[PDB]
UniProtKB/Swiss-Prot annotation:
PANTHER family named among the record's database cross-references: PARVALBUMIN ALPHA
Protein name: Parvalbumin alpha
Source lineage: Eukaryota, Metazoa, Chordata, Craniata, Vertebrata
Modified residues (N-acetylserine): S2
Organism: Homo sapiens (Human)
CC terms in the record's Gene Ontology section: axon; cytoplasm; synapse
Thermal properties: Thermostable between pH 4.0-9.5. Average melting temperature (Tm) across all pH values is 72 degrees Celsius. Lower melting temperature in acidic pH 4.0-5.0.
């Protein structure tokens, strides 16, 4: 992890803006504005690990209400409608969690 060094602080500054709403979590456009899909697959491992505070290897509603705190400060509390839709979109597998390889490619569906 290290959401500045691995990625780009400027791109992150735009990205935290691209989620600066209640429910309007355009993950596809965040992952574009932050340059994520332009960084390495092995960078995308260090990406996911910044959101998975637990280091349990899976992100779920407890973290996913404020996942932005791994992207940077000024993050805030996401809406109850957001977390519901975001877990249901971000779990491509059917296990109810965001996994890294899903999250990387979930946004390539753009
Ligand atoms: Ca977790
Ligand atoms: Ca999954």
């Amino acid at each position: 992890m290290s959401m500045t060094d691995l990625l780009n602080a400027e791109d992150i500054k735009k990205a935290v803006g691209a989620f600066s709403a209640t429910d309007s979590f355009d993950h596809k456009k965040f992952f574009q504005m932050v340059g994520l899909k332009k960084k390495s697959a092995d960078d995308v491992k260090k990406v996911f690990h910044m959101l998975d505070k637990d280091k349990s290897g899976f992100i779920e509603e407890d973290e996913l209400g404020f996942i932005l705190k791994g992207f940077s400060p000024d993050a805030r509390d996401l809406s109850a409608k957001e977390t519901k839709m975001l877990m249901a979109a971000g779990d491509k597998d059917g296990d109810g969690k965001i996994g890294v390889d899903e999250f990387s490619t979930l946004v390539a569906e753009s």
